[PDB]
Structure 1
Amino acid sequence: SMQDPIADMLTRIRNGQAANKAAVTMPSSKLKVAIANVLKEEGFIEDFKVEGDTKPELELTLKYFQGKAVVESIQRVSRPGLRIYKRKDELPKVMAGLGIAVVSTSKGVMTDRAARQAGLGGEIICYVA
């Protein structure tokens, strides 16, 4: 059965980029929206919108640069079978700082750079490169 909606979100992005899809659609959730926000502010996706009331639907507009997917790699880190939490001094660096790690801190979901500036650790959701 479905047991990790976040990994399903990342996979839909990974598979949609490989299929040269202009957009991917998926059932929504506040955590998925919080992750979509970070992906947009970092310029990895183009836009997102939530549509619907009783069964919300999240749609992510993917971007391509020179005919290549912008998301070169996207990978789940913390997962239901094995949670990963890091302290502020041990937050990971993705691609020597060229990528991002999406971290869930007590001040919300943000990148690893933002969590370092706020002096917070948290749960490492995924790497994006």
Structure 2
Amino acid sequence: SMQDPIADMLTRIRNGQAANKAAVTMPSSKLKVAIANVLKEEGFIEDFKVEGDTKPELELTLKYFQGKAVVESIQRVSRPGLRIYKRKDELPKVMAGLGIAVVSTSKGVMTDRAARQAGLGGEIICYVA
């Protein structure tokens, strides 16, 4: 059975980047979608597009630079068997900051550095690099 779709999304992205697929697609969700927002906002993806009424289908379009993939690495941090909450002062850096770490906060989803600026911690969803 499916226990974590955020995980499934990250894996699918990983494999599409691995396989030189232009895009990748999967069932759509709100959190999934705000994550896609984020990633675009940080320019690891070219664009996402959700489609469907009933069981809508999210479609990420992947990004390749000088051939190689652009999401060097992507790895979940919290998870249903083990969640990972942090205080603002406790926010990690991804790749010494050359990367990002997606985080949910009470003010929606967003990367680590935006969170720092805002001044509030939350749930570290995943590192991207």
Q: Give the share of equivalent positions with the same residue, in percent.
A: 100
Show structure 1 runs of 4+ deviating over 6 A.
none
Structure 2: where are the runs of 5+ without partners?
Answer: none
Cα deviation digits, residues 94-126 of structure 1 (max 9, x gap): 000100000100000000000000000000000
Structure-2-length-normalised TM-score:
0.99
- In structure 1, distance between residues paired with 2:108 and 2:52: 24
Cα deviation digits, residues 33-69 of structure 1 (max 9, x gap): 0100000000001001110101100000000000000
Cα deviation digits, residues 57-98 of structure 1 (max 9, x gap): 000000000000000000010000000000000101000010
**1:7 Cα deviation (Å)?**
0.3
**1:27 Cα deviation (Å)?**
0.1
Structure-1-length-normalised TM-score:
0.99
Number of equivalent positions: 129
Structure 1: where are the runs of 5+ without partners?
Answer: none
Matches within 5 A, 1:41-56: 41-56=41-56
Partner of 1:67: 67
Note the aligned Cα RMSD (angstroms): 0.4
**1:12 Cα deviation (Å)?**
0.2
Partner of 2:34: 34
- In structure 1, distance between residues paired with 2:37 and 2:80: 22
- In structure 2, distance between residues paired with 1:84 and 1:126: 10
Cα deviation digits, residues 2-46 of structure 1 (max 9, x gap): 000000000000011000000000000000001000000000010
SS in 2 for 1:95: coil
- In structure 1, distance between residues paired with 2:9 and 2:21: 15
- In structure 1, distance between residues paired with 2:66 and 2:6: 28
- In structure 1, distance between residues paired with 2:36 and 2:120: 21
